[PDB]
Amino acid sequence: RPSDAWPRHSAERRPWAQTQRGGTRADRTLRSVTVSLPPYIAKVDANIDADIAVKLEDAMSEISRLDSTHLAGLSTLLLRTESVASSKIERVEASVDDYARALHGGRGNSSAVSMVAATTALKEMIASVNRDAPIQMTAILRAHEALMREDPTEGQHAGQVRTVQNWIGGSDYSPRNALYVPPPPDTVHAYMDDLIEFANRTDIPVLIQAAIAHAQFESIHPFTDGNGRIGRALINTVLRRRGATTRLVVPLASALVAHRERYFGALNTYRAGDLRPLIVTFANSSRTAAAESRITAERLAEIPVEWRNMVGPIRRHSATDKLLLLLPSTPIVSSDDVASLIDAPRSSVFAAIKRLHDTGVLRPLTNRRDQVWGASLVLDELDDLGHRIERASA
């Protein structure tokens, strides 16, 4: 097979019947559906073009320099930036403060709860790998469980592969006019094993492996719901499993979210056996995400200096110094949390809070009582990174 060629998907005609009656008549009389059958890739090789190798290489240059930055706050921020962007791809959205409240346990905004869930699902899936530990099917199921646990009427089977026939697009009530039909459920176990073997290889360039592992995951589409968010989480798991990263996540979903149809497009093209758009999308996305994350690392470091110009003189060991010290790792803190977390009298801690509030370091996220506080510059860097990455995707 040529350069950037890949074994293409085949089709097969399966019987299909509506389990839940509704839709139009055409949905109800439909008796047959054409499923796509992805290749088995665990043993496949891919030779790819030079211009693409350079692009992958330039992405890895940035990914490597990002991962070698020695910093408080950075790792958590990047993880959350990726999760927020990955959720935005499935139109699960909320404001910065909605999300900050949800990170602290707030539950009134179900979108922000899901955004926090996708954050857990990525954090736990990456935690499981290259402690010489391979990518395991257990971590994928646990990540899906973490994401879909509190989901309404969708999290009924959180943590289990689908047992029914799904499809993407077309009719709401049948696979009529679907743009893609994943393989039948009785083949998902055979396919995930093949993928998990493929995702554990060490004889492929890391970005190519990540990129094809994602596309293949999306082609299998093993879950009833959530395949975008868990499938994208697998990208950074492969990065971490190969040592391509070690201490931080690459937030490429912020680049993907900026050109969504092109991303979905690379999945269609993968299925037809062309690797070039998938890998170019992955190389450009990773390059932009890592480059801007590096600038975010500088800016995060400039922030404490910014904070204390604002707050004025601070005594070298007061509460105000103790507090100002911890905020970079922990930018979302309640008054009772801070008082707990600082060795100092609980009412001189409550003074440092008021001082940081009055100087503009802290902003209130709750009225409540046990007021929850957010480091504004940290919360706004979270948001500025995402805009800068979307901007730099041309």
Ligand X SMILES: Nc1ccn([C@@H]2O[C@H](COP(=O)(O)OP(=O)(O)O)[C@@H](O)[C@H]2O)c(=O)n1
Residue 169 token pair: 């697009």
Is 82 among the residues that bind ligand X (CB under 6 A)?
Answer: no
Is 377 among the residues that bind ligand X (CB under 6 A)?
Answer: no
Cβ distance to ligand X smaller for residue 58 or 90? 90
Task: Write each residue from 185 to 224 as x if it is in contact with ligand X (CB under 6 A), else as -, in one continuous string.
Answer: ---------------------------------x------
* Strand positions, DSSP E, 324-389: 332-334, 362-364, 372-375
Is 231 among the residues that bind ligand X (CB under 6 A)?
Answer: yes
Residue 130 assigned as binding residue: no
Q: Which of 292, 218, 219 is nearest to 251 (CA)?
A: 292
Is 383 among the residues that bind ligand X (CB under 6 A)?
Answer: no
Q: Using CB under 6 A, pick the residue from 239, 267, 344, 356 that binds ligand X.
A: 267
Query: In angstroms, rounded to a whole number, what is the distance separating the alpha carbons of residues 175 and 218?
Result: 17
Residue 109 assigned as binding residue: no
Is 227 among the residues that bind ligand X (CB under 6 A)?
Answer: yes
Owner of token pair 């693409």: 52
Is 89 among the residues that bind ligand X (CB under 6 A)?
Answer: yes
Q: Using CB under 6 A, pick the residue from 73, 106, 222, 226 that binds ligand X.
A: 226
Cβ distance to ligand X smaller for residue 194 or 218? 218
Task: Name the one range near ligand X by CB under 6 A: 100-108, 225-233, 318-326, 344-352.
Answer: 225-233
Is 165 among the residues that bind ligand X (CB under 6 A)?
Answer: no
Query: In angstroms, rounded to a whole number, what is the distance separating the alpha carbons of residues 264 and 247?
Result: 29
Cβ distance to ligand X smaller for residue 133 or 179? 179
Residue 363 pairs with which residues in a beta bridge? Answer: 374
Q: Give whole-number Cα distances, 318 to 265, 324, 325, 382, in Å.
A: 56, 10, 11, 28
Query: In angstroms, rounded to a whole number, what is the distance separating the alpha carbons of residues 299 and 319?
Result: 24
70 is catalytic: no
DSSP 293-325: HHHHHHHHHHHHHHHHHHH----TTSHHHHHHH
Q: Which of 70, 189, 214, 221 is catalytic?
A: 221
Q: Where on the chain is the footprint of ligand X (CB under 6 A)?
A: 89-90, 168, 179-180, 218, 225-229, 231, 264, 267-268
